[PDB]
Symmetry: C3
Subunit: 417 residues, 3 copies
């Protein structure tokens, strides 16, 4: 007889497949994601780059008559008339020497450049670094790469480019980390007679721990370290991965570097800051990339400093960056003990040829290492991929192919006639 | 060749048992009301800057303590053993004992009305005197940007309380520039001499600070962090928004549970509310920093009932004042660091600017920077892992597999069974 | 033969089903995991153990002529000739007493033991502890357990297994925690005339907050606390649970307790370090477990310190520890204020019978407590278990079987072709 039951079942089988495909395909277009977390003790962890700056930008003994003439006003050492202000806070022979230095009678100005000034007058790592050790191995001034920041001449440990085939840490604790003893040299601090962006009321250093493929932004993001203490910095590397649209909203540039090889929030901000200053001040500050001419002291005071301050303080629209797809964050827990103890003050004073009082106001020890659970990952993952879609329809699709197959083994003869 | 009949018969049966087991196991799972906690850490824009409350560790300014104050609160502050003997304890500042011995002479003195709130409000440190400089995102702030708030430390101040005005302060980029920077003078010259150990006296110098959501009251004596004079302290933060699910899936309490003294539910609001009811019931008074309208405890009540009662609650209590988890919580992760102030090179400038000795600057001035790091926003939210719609979808998919498999049977066992 | 359009149906049929099953089965064999996170305010949270050490290892007043003879060089107080270098080095007050104590004229060395020296000369909790309060209740020296570490004689508050009820925290804040005031006693600090693993340029204490079943490794993992400040340590307990193979690479506390009842990274490191030193120096440092003989001060300087330093600084393969399946981490946020204020110095000086100057250079207060959200859990869970696999492809691998039988039962009757 006539069995419509077969044509009805075939339709159903196709109908069920249509619904499953529509449902699963709709969910797929929602491009959902899941964030996977894990916190473990990784081995062979790559030690980061560590940048540090003295809070004092220019060494008093390195400031010359010509430097004073050109940048004196910027440093608040001279008034708008090339003269020492009514601010004479130096009952010492520091004012005396400064007045001789400020004597411009018959003085002939010589060429001046801010970058050269920072490079020449900035604190010298060779003098600041009293000792340096990384995982039991002694490091020297040469292990530090010079990098210019808003603080001027700063230094980066393990910047990555030398030999030492990637520095790594294996265990938790100070032993597997970096330990440095520094002399901040307050005797070389520039007298502070006013408040300016280059002026500092504080003594110590600013530090920033960051990935080697990310430039520092130490004036904004660094942490402080005070003289007279041994500071312990226990860290945890946190690797965050994000997804680009339609899943997420991150971004990731390719090899080609407008200024920086890798994309990061800092690289983006510095890039944007530089273009903003070049456009508005027709010059770049000494710590900025590119080839525009460096700003003169006058431009720093009249345009550059106020322009950058606007960007890092008030701006809400000019330099806003998009999330990178790859970010490395370093969680840190800081603590400190006093240096020197009464029992070691004499030993340190003699060793470095300083008074005991000096040691207590200038020496600092900094330990940067990782805790046992040194590695955490937070990665956005695609929740419903193709393999997941096909798998979700494969089951129902099979039953349909089967019905069609059984339809073939049922009409093979009739069809063949 | 009859086996080809039982095969499609067993398959159908099996396909039936599978539909049953899977569906039953998924409805049971549903009734376990499971949850998933979703985590995401990003760099948010237009982040709302939190409220920042701070208190001087010294509760009463020496120069503002009068004869009447000493008469009423001298015992509480450990400055007097009784009202008939003259103080004789040497003070760091020699002139303080002399002034104290004169203020302590009550012979022929007529006591005037006294109030602890009035005393705190009048003798507590003045923000207009402590605040040397204040800047938020490049803009200069002033004492008026600070709202007076009473805590267990007495008269304290909150920056960006969000009580008055309207202009919501926002942060956009990571770093000190997008944050708050304040320079304070803690005024140790105004610190009351410490001659005994009480809950109102302190061995320390500096301030206590608490960064909190604007809709959450502070609990600074318990949860604040310290900031020391002689340093510039950097506080790099990260906002963490946590969302919890109610009783079925979780065990939180809607931040709208019959608002008592506060309109938003938080652990702190709950603790303060509970503490207040405890004190009003057991002491018949409330401390100056507590809400409500109960009478304010007198100095006598502070010493005899209030301090002991509040200490019991924040230290020993395990049952009286316990709070349920709120469904909405905002935590601020913080990383602190510091550098020294002043440098030898700036000490003279600061001394001259504020007419103080260089030594004074070194023991009283501090600078505090509160800002956010690049990845300023983290979210940790509990979500229902299996809702009804999800259960239906799964059941619908299972039936789809059932019908699909059974069709092969009806089609191969048609001629036979029918 | 047009029989292929019949042989393909069975093969194609078993193809799809096989594909659908292999998909989830291959996934199952990857043994995927999911990490569940939660952060809450737990009630009756178990307070951790808190270990602390003075940065100075030996009290000047407790050093004897015989201690000086045996440990002098190790402490840099004597040169390799048993003599005190150029007098112009330290306080003449201490120099004199030290010169007298160093006078070895026809002196006969008596037996010496480093453990005994640390125990006798190390700082005494009875002297360092000025006050101690836990949740409003006074604690005392008897509340601290002695524990030897590389810093020498240290102390642990709430070590546990002390026959007392478990200490618990219920609310956030300083009130529900520990507060201790210590005197670091710089007047007892050994003069420093050189740099050795046993000398310190710093003054203060080292502290380590840890679970009671985990030994301390304070020289490597502790945090510092400075004199002249009240330090606040706001904590959050974080419980991490990991899965063993094939899901993960963690190892649980199985077998016997070679040295410790529970497994932890620190227990593993201390065990390994001990074995390493016994092998290379045939002795163990005072803070190590076991029964090997204690290294002499000469062995410390010539073999032990260099050996341990190698392990904690340079080694990359000798002591590699596996991940525990259970870990408790304590996140912490530190802050501080100054002590004493100008207004409280006299009171403290009088109360503890010390000069005002002494108070400012030796006293410190430490507060260890938990924030409101005191408990975080991060646990690895199995993502795809057998029941889940069967729930996904139970029907497919079921039909595949039937199709297979139906197939074997097919080409079988096909064997009929043999006749012809
Ligand atoms: O990659 C995500 C995807 O993984 C698994 O699919 C695997 C499959 O199990 C393997 O046998 C092989 O075919 O590679 C596939 C991925 O390309 C999961 O089964 C699937 O749900 C998931 O989406
Ligand atoms: O049938 C095999 C197939 O079962 C599951 O796919 C389900 C899906 O998860 C449901 O949401 C709904 O769409 O029904 C589908 C089955 O028809 C497994 O998730 C999938 O991996 C498996 O291949
Ligand atoms: O019982 C906890 C368990 O429930 C669910 O696993 C189910 C599965 O979904 C069903 O299809 C069937 O196989 O029974 C299983 C339980 O025995 C959840 O999917 C699973 O995550 C959860 O642990
Ligand atoms: C993220 O960048 C780091 C280098 O900083 C690299 O090692 C890692 O593989 C990257 N992750 C991904 C998947 O892009
Ligand atoms: C030590 O410092 C003094 C004073 O500045 C100086 O005269 C002397 O040359 C220095 N000694 C050495 C060896 O550098
Ligand atoms: C509680 O959390 C929900 C979910 O984000 C939010 O919409 C609400 O504003 C929060 N608090 C309330 C009830 O206002
Ligand atoms: C502030 O300095 C002035 C002189 O510049 C002095 O007369 C005055 O007494 C000082 N302020 C006080 C009262 O401490
Ligand atoms: C983890 O270890 C602790 C002991 O430190 C124990 O109390 C707890 O029950 C353990 N948790 C699990 C899931 O094993
Ligand atoms: C106080 O210290 C002095 C000098 O160190 C000592 O002689 C005296 O015994 C101490 N007082 C008491 C009662 O301990
Ligand atoms: Cl910017
Ligand atoms: Cl309470
Ligand atoms: Cl080791």
């Amino acid at each position: 007889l006539k069995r419509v039951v077969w044509a009805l079942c075939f339709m159903g089988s196709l109908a069920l497949l249509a619904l499953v495909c529509t449902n699963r395909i709709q969910y797929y277009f929602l491009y959902p994601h899941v964030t996977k977390l894990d916190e473990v003790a990784a081995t062979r962890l790559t030690f980061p780059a560590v940048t540090f700056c003295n809070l004092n930008e220019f060494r008093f003994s390195r400031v010359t008559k010509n430097d004073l003439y050109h940048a004196g006003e910027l440093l608040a050492l001279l008034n708008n008339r090339y003269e020492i202000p009514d601010t004479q806070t130096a009952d010492e022979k520091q004012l005396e020497i400064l007045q001789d230095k400020a004597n411009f009678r018959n003085f002939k100005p010589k060429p001046f450049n801010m970058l050269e000034f920072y490079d020449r007058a900035g604190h010298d790592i060779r003098e600041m670094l009293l000792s340096c050790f990384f995982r039991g191995e002694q490091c020297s001034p040469e292990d530090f790469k010079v990098v210019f920041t808003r603080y001027g001449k700063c230094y980066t440990f393990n910047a990555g480019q030398d030999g030492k085939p990637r520095l790594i840490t294996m265990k938790g604790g100070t032993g597997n980390g970096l330990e440095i003893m520094l002399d901040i040299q307050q005797d070389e601090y520039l007298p502070v007679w006013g408040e300016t962006d280059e002026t500092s009321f504080e003594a110590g250093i600013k530090v920033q721990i960051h990935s080697q493929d990310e430039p520092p932004l130490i004036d904004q993001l660094g942490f402080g370290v005070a003289p007279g203490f041994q500071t312990f910095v226990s860290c945890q590397e946190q690797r965050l991965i994000y997804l680009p649209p339609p899943w997420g909203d991150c971004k990731a540039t390719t090899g080609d570097s407008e200024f920086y090889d890798t994309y990061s929030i800092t690289a983006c901000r510095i890039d944007c800051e530089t273009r903003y200053l070049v456009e508005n001040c027709n010059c770049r500050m000494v710590h900025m990339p590119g080839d525009a001419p460096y700003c003169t002291p006058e431009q720093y005071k009249e345009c550059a400093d106020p322009a950058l301050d606007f960007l890092v303080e008030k701006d809400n629209e000019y330099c806003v960056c998009e999330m990178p797809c790859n970010v490395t964050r370093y969680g840190k827990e800081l603590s400190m003990v006093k240096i020197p103890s009464k029992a070691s003050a004499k030993y340190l004073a003699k060793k470095y040829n300083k008074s005991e009082q000096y040691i207590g106001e200038n020496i600092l020890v900094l330990d940067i290492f990782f805790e046992a659970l040194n590695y955490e990952t937070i990665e956005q993952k695609k929740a419903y991929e193709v393999a997941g879609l096909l798998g979700d329809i494969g089951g129902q699709m099979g039953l349909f192919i089967g019905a069609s197959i059984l339809t073939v083994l049922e009409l093979f003869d009739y069809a063949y006639e």
